[PDB]
Amino acid sequence: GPLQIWQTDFTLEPRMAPRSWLAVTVDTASSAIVVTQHGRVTSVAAQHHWATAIAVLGRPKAIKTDNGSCFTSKSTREWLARWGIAHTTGIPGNSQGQAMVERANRLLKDKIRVLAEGDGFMKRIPTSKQGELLAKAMYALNH
Amino acid sequence: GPLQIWQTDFTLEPRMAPRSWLAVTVDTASSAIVVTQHGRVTSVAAQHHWATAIAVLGRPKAIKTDNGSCFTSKSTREWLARWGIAHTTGIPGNSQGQAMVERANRLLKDKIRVLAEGDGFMKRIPTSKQGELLAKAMYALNH
């Protein structure tokens, strides 16, 4: 739709190392999730994530995040303005701007663990298998 | 929907080198496009592409391709059977199974060129900028 409001954060998932930082977006009205893998939490990683999320879900009206450096930076402020997307920040875990994405963090990590163990991976997923496993987890949660 | 029929092919786009092989899927009923970048045309690259496409569009009922090696291989036949997705092959360019995806190849390449030149890239896109540019092209065509 034309009035989406997203919540975005980062969560660490060592099953996906070396690119173990998962950037996670939930669309607040639909609950759809987009997830991407990153080697580090940086302003540019957030921006790469949102570029992917726009290609999957469409362009949102606003994004809610916490007040960490990758969200409060001049870089990210300009990227969001470039796209015409509004942005509000708050404290880590604030229920208003972040509780839904915290729940998606946990749903994703549980699903990644179940799929991985099912394929016989009890610890880190082999690098060559990670992309398809992450995409299967996203498919499964969105169904 | 639950009855999608896709057409998939590969097209070479040197603006995106070194990962210049674009895997392209169109959903035949909706005309939505998914595109991913690959360094080589292989059975596994097709499979990585379709894993992404399932996370974006949902699981299709069938996929139409040509009869190249990456589509007729025992590997790809098993991957598709694993997912419960039916598959038909035909001759390169057959209008029945491939004309729509050939049109998406051309729409994508034109859009990539327009965006790239707009950002001042007259030849290859800088590697660090390619992911977001490809995702912008996919967004723009699907809108």
Structural summary, described in words:
2 copies of one chain form a homodimer. Chain A has 143 residues and is an alpha/beta fold. Chain A has one domain: Ribonuclease H-like superfamily/Ribonuclease H (Nucleotidyltransferase, domain 5, 2-Layer Sandwich), CATH 3.30.420.10. Chain A is 48% helix and 22% strand. The first copy, chain A, has a 5-stranded mixed beta sheet. In chain A, a hairpin with an 8-residue loop joins strand 1 and strand 2. In chain A, helix 4 packs across helix 5. The interface between A and B is medium-sized, with 17 and 17 residues. Chains A, B: This is Integrase. Chains A, B: It comes from Rous sarcoma virus subgroup C (strain Prague). Chains A, B: Homodimer; further associates as a homooctamer.
Please specify the SSE layout and strand pairing.
The structure is a homodimer of 143-residue chains.
Chain A: E1 5-12, E2 21-27, E3 33-38, H1 43-57, E4 62-66, H2 69-72, H3 74-82, E5 86-90, H4 95-118, H5 127-142
Helix pairs in contact in A: 1-3, 4-5
